[PDB]
Amino acid sequence: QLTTESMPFNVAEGKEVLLLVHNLPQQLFGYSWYKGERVDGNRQIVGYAIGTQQATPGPANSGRETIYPNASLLIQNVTQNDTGFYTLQVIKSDLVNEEATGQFHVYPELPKPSISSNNSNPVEDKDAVAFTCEPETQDTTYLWWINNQSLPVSPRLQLSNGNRTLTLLSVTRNDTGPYECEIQNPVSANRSDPVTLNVT
Ligand SMILES: *[C@@H]1O[C@H](CO)[C@@H](O)[C@H](O)[C@H]1NC(C)=O
Ligand SMILES: *[C@@H]1O[C@H](CO)[C@@H](O)[C@H](O)[C@H]1NC(C)=O
Ligand SMILES: *[C@@H]1O[C@H](CO)[C@@H](O)[C@H](O)[C@H]1NC(C)=O
Ligand SMILES: *[C@@H]1O[C@H](CO)[C@@H](O)[C@H](O)[C@H]1NC(C)=O
Ligand SMILES: *[C@@H]1O[C@H](CO)[C@@H](O)[C@H](O)[C@H]1NC(C)=O
Ligand SMILES: *[C@@H]1O[C@H](CO)[C@@H](O)[C@H](O)[C@H]1NC(C)=O
Ligand SMILES: *[C@@H]1O[C@H](CO)[C@@H](O)[C@H](O)[C@H]1NC(C)=O
């Protein structure tokens, strides 16, 4: 049961991903890595022939891919477009083909976000000011930080636009504190400048 493992599963842009191979048969004739779930000649990335110990790039090669004698495929200077499935073809000594599949995801290196307010001078007795992390990004998870702690879940803490927008239904002067926003993707995360609440 040939299997493939992508180490790491998630990779930031510009780094490299190494695909490992397990349960490799004892008798082998050659390997081949193809872009996509289907073994097709046009999608061949690289091939290796144990008999002649020759490694030859395929039509889909871009110079960033190298094949090791242990069937491991190394891709350097990865990019977002590389996110997809990869299939390994193993040719046994008897030339009967055995296939396997693997995948990995590429994610951007997010920047520190920013916060904007729809009201800059909250009314002390009550107000419905709204906060939002403006630099919207895909497949990102938003976290709101208040007073150096996670937001206390309460109905007064409304959320919108998924939860990229945080609205305090009823503000109070006791709510004064540092307001900070974080974005985290499967690979990286850091926070924004803490905004303050104005009252007197
Ligand atoms: C395969 O060979 C490369 C280069 O020596 C190495 O980095 C990698 O860990 C090896 N993988 C396995 C499963 O042996
Ligand atoms: C990585 O890819 C980018 C875009 O082609 C290029 O500008 C950069 O020089 C490459 N870096 C390396 C070490 O190959
Ligand atoms: C930290 O923020 C800076 C600038 O916004 C950005 O270059 C970097 O990708 C971020 N690093 C992490 C681990 O989130
Ligand atoms: C703007 O701030 C005021 C403060 O009371 C609030 O009533 C209103 O709902 C907010 N509108 C938006 C789009 O955030
Ligand atoms: C408080 O702020 C610091 C950064 O200034 C941060 O490292 C720390 O995790 C925060 N503490 C809590 C409980 O969130
Ligand atoms: C924000 O939206 C995401 C959607 O997956 C959810 O997982 C998360 O629990 C939400 N956070 C809050 C405080 O509602
Ligand atoms: C505000 O915080 C102070 C802390 O001593 C507390 O005594 C007071 O009851 C709070 N007022 C309201 C309206 O929550």
Author numbering: 35 to 234
Can you list sentences taken from the study reporting this PDB entry?
Whereas previous structural analysis by X-ray crystallography only resolved the N-terminal IgV-like domain of CEACAM1 (residues 35–142), our cryo-EM structure, after shifting the center of reconstruction toward one CEACAM1, also resolves the following IgC2-like A1 domain (residues 35–234 in total). Although the ECD of CEACAM1 is highly glycosylated and our data revealed several glycosylation sites on the IgV-like and IgC2-like A1 domains, no glycans are involved in the interaction with CbpF. For CEACAM1, the residues with highest SASA differences (F63, Q78, G85, T86, T90, L129) are arranged around a cavity at the tip of the IgV domain where the interaction with CbpF occurs. While the IgC-like domains are heavily glycosylated, the IgV-like domain that is involved in interaction with CbpF is less glycosylated.
The fusobacterial trimeric autotransporter adhesin (TAA) CbpF binds to CEACAM1 on immune cells, resulting in downregulation of their activity against tumors colonized by F. nucleatum. In contrast to Fap2, CbpF is a homotrimeric type Vc autotransporter protein, in which all three protomers together form a trimeric passenger domain that remains exposed on the cell surface after expression, and a C-terminal β-barrel domain that serves as a membrane anchor. The ECD of CEACAM1 comprises an N-terminal, membrane-distal immunoglobulin variable region-like (IgV-like) domain and three membrane-proximal immunoglobulin constant region-like (IgC2-like) domains IgC2-like A1, IgC2-like B, and IgC2-like A2. CbpF binds to CEACAM1 via a protruding loop (D142–Y149) and via H92 on the respective adjacent protomer chain.
